[PDB]
Structure formats: C-alpha cells, structure tokens
Amino acid sequence: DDDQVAFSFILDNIVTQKMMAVPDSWPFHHPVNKKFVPDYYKVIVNPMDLETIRKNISKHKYQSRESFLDDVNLILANSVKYNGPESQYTKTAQEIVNVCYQTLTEYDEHLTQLEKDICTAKEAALEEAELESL
C-alpha cells in the first residue's frame, strides 16, 4: 500500500512543475523574511508559501485535495490582504491557484480513488488500535 506516497507525489509535482513555474512567482516560493518585508507579519497572521506546502507534502500532511487547496488558497487570501485585490502580486497568486486547480483535474479519477482508499485504511488502522488497547 503506497497510496499516501502516490498521493503526495502527485501534489509535489503540481507544486514544483506547475505552480513554481508560473512566471514571476518567486515572491511565493519561500516564507517572507521580515528583514526584507518589515511589515509583513504585522498584517499576515497565518502565513503560507510554496516551500512550506512542499514540507507539508513531504510529511504527508494532506490526505485530501481539499486540505491541500486550503493552504494553496491561504496564499491567495494573504496576497489580497497584504497587497490588495488588484496588485500584480495578487494577479500572480491567482495564476498559481488557477494552474493548481487545472493540473489537479488531470488526476481527478486517480485522486478520488486515492482519497477513498487512504480513508478506508486510516479507519481500519484506527479500529485495530482501539481493539488492541482493550
């Protein structure tokens, strides 16, 4: 059963091959350094970036497309808050989100099945642990 590794492989390749390849997406590649953007963390209370999402994928944080997309959306929402809805930074963040949604559709059937199977295995392992404890 390599379902979690296969799921994470798909998400990681969307991040590196598609999202990070959006032109001029460098502002979103790494966490903001306050030495470079002094007021950032005075405004943004739930920061996010693509390197952090990759570290999360490597730790198998995401078991669903919805949970992965929550962090992807946090990047867009943070740019709307910090830069404004019309800023070029926000237009770039919107392109990152849209390429993410478009690339995920290429794996719709497979990701649907992987999410179901990961869930089934999680539930069965939980029941086994509960029974072993009693």
Ligand SMILES: C=CCCn1cc(-c2cccc(C(=O)N3CCOCC3)c2)c2cc[nH]c2c1=O
């Ligand atoms: C992840 C979301 C943050 C996206 N973002 C990034 C920067 C910006 C501009 C210059 C340097 C940096 C910066 O700290 N760097 C470089 C990238 O590598 C990490 C160190 C960030 C910025 C400036 C005004 N608005 C934004 C902004 O919304």
